[PDB]
Amino acid sequence: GSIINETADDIVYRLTVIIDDRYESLKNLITLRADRLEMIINDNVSTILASI
Amino acid sequence: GSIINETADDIVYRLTVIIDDRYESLKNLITLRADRLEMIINDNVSTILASI
Amino acid sequence: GSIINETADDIVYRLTVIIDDRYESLKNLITLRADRLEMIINDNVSTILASI
Amino acid sequence: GSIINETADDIVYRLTVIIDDRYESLKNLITLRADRLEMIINDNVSTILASI
Ligand SMILES: c1ccc2ccccc2c1
Numbered sequence: 001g002s003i004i005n006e007t008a009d010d011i012v013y014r015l016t017v018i019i020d021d022r023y024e025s026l027k028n029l030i031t032l033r034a035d036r037l038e039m040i041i042n043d044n045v046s047t048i049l050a051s052i
Numbered sequence: 053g054s055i056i057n058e059t060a061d062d063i064v065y066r067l068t069v070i071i072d073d074r075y076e077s078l079k080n081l082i083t084l085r086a087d088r089l090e091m092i093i094n095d096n097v098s099t100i101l102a103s104i
Numbered sequence: 105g106s107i108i109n110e111t112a113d114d115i116v117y118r119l120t121v122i123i124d125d126r127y128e129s130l131k132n133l134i135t136l137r138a139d140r141l142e143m144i145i146n147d148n149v150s151t152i153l154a155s156i
Numbered sequence: 157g158s159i160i161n162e163t164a165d166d167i168v169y170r171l172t173v174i175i176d177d178r179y180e181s182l183k184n185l186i187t188l189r190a191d192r193l194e195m196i197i198n199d200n201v202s203t204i205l206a207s208i
């Protein structure tokens with residue numbers, strides 16, 4: 001439209017990309033560490049149960 | 053308000069919607085995974101106690 | 105005048121509050137769920153050890 | 157080179173620095189608390205396994 005609403009759209013867009021990238025990083029990390037805890041807990045409990 | 057004041061509110065508002073959405077996502081993911089770990093732990097302890 | 109400088113300062117300042125508030129919320133949530141899980145584990149292990 | 161194009165670059169950069177700072181803190185927090193939980197889980201299981 002004009003010079004103002006475009007410069008605003010550019011600010012919103014660029015920072016949105018930043019926010020989105022940092023979001024995905026945190027999302028994948030949370031997922032990664034939670035999967036590890038599940039794996040470790042499962043393996044250990046299975047070891048305990050296998051040890052009378 | 054003035055043009056620039058309305059444009060400032062719009063930039064903040066839009067990026068706040070973004071930040072909030074991403075925050076809720078991580079908030080929900082963290083809660084989901086932690087809740088599941090507690091579910092897994094509580095179940096495993098019940099099995100270990102049943103196996104004496 | 106200087107309204108563009110001030111508005112940019114005003115924009116950065118407002119979104120900083122948003123970002124920091126959500127950060128603290130996630131920081132406390134992550135910290136809270138970790139304390140809970142550690143407590144649950146320690147409690148359960150003591151229960152298991154009390155049952156030979 | 158424009159009046160507001162530099163302003164936009166400043167706003168995005170200034171908030172990017174803040175986002176990066178908070179993102180890194182959560183990343184470190186998530187890593188540290190998960191590393192801690194994994195240690196606690198294994199240390200506890202070693203105790204149980206050592207109790208017939
Ligand atoms: C601390 C670190 C990582 C986690 C992942 C999922 C749920 C809770 C957590 C607590």
Ligand SMILES: c1ccc2ccccc2c1
Pocket residue numbers: 019020022023071074075123124126127130175178179
């Ligand atoms: C997504 C990405 C980074 C963030 C940093 C702080 C608070 C919320 C966030 C949401």
